Design a binder for this molecule. Structure first.
Ligand code: ONQ
Ligand code: CL
Ligand code: CL
Ligand code: CL
Ligand code: CL
Ligand code: MN
Length: 340
């Protein structure tokens, strides 16, 4: 029946069911003040779906010059046309190929660039901003968003939103690699999955997705969203509490040294954004440091709320279009303060 909310991660993650429900703040407040991430489903049903297709991005902006990253080896592909990315989004045989002759898993880097989203795409901006959940926290002029209200003693976020576009990771070896490596942000963020592209040509890649989710350490209720409701899964997230950041640094310093890296003892492997925590490193983090995270599968229309200071990483299961907005909640303002 109509339910206001449910729990995922064996009770540890709030999942709100109606993104426009004026009472969401009452349940959200409590979980958010404890430094938890939150998931809101059903945002895709609020959007104009014709504005968020790969084909329309290709047609309208195809001639713009961009760089891409090879997600498998971190190689940068320099000064190509953005249509070279979009036209292989879903059709595998159209994708740029590596020396080995295999179609590459690519991320479109920094597009639209800097703070240009609103200028380049005024109709998309309107469609997203008008349908963000928890609007008092997430809108530019929201009463509980301090972004526009803080003095220079605070690190203020850029004007957004930002778009995150990348292919899905495919093989058994791709399971140990990230779309976005482990990092943290000094402000809060909401990340919405506006489109999930399920590719064709090698269109029998269903079972590898399920083994990645399973090995990802995803909860039984999350697996029921696929098998029962036939929802489209986009990305596997791992998020850790802000207060566990330094323990994670201690693990990654030790593993670095083990792997022959020669780093100063105070260097910051989270700020380096060079690590993905695979099943081996997540197990080790649990056993040797007593740190546990949230394994979150972001489906089409799912909004992921990321607390300020929380280390997080992303692994695309299929090809994803994501749009993210920064904000500064009073709950977490400490994380962007320039003193002590
Ligand atoms: C910050 O400490 C914790 C401790 C435990 C969890 C948890 O139950 N995770 C389950 C899952 N499937 O991801 C989340 C956070
Ligand atoms: Cl906090
Ligand atoms: Cl537009
Ligand atoms: Cl609100
Ligand atoms: Cl990255
Ligand atoms: Mn981020």
């Amino acid at each position: 029946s109509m339910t206001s909310h449910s729990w995922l991660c064996d009770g540890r993650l709030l999942c709100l069911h109606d993104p426009s429900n004026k009472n969401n703040w009452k349940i959200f407040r409590e979980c958010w003040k404890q430094g938890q991430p939150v998931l809101v489903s059903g945002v895709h049903k609020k959007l104009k779906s014709e504005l968020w297709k790969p084909e329309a991005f290709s047609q309208e902006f195809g001639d713009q010059d961009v760089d891409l990253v090879n997600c498998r080896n971190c190689a940068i592909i320099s000064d190509v046309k953005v249509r070279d990315f979009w036209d292989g989004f879903e059709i595998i045989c159209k994708r740029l190929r590596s020396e080995d002759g295999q179609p590459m898993v690519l991320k479109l880097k920094d597009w639209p660039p800097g703070e240009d989203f609103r200028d380049m795409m005024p109709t998309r901006f309107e469609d997203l901003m008008e349908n963000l959940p928890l609007p008092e926290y997430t809108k530019r002029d929201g009463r509980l968003n301090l972004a526009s209200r803080l003095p220079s003693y605070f690190v203020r976020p850029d004007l957004g939103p930002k778009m995150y576009n990348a292919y899905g990771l495919i093989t058994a070896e791709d399971r140990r690699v990230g779309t976005t490596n482990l990092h943290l942000d000094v402000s809060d963020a909401v990340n919405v999955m506006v489109y999930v592209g399920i590719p064709i040509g090698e269109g029998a890649h269903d079972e590898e997705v399920l083994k990645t989710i399973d090995e990802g350490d995803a909860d039984e209720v999350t697996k029921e969203r696929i098998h029962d409701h036939k929802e489209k899964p986009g990305a596997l997230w791992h998020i850790y509490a802000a207060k566990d950041a330094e323990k994670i640094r201690e693990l990654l310093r030790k593993v670095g040294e083990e792997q022959g890296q020669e780093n100063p003892p105070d260097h910051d492997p989270i700020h380096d954004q060079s690590w993905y925590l695979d099943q081996t490193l997540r197990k080790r983090l649990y056993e040797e440091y007593g740190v546990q995270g949230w394994a979150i599968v972001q489906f089409l229309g799912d909004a992921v709320f990321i607390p300020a200071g929380a280390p997080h990483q992303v692994h695309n299961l299929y090809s994803c279009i994501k749009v993210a907005e920064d904000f500064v909640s009073p709950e977490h303002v400490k994380h962007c303060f320039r003193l002590t």
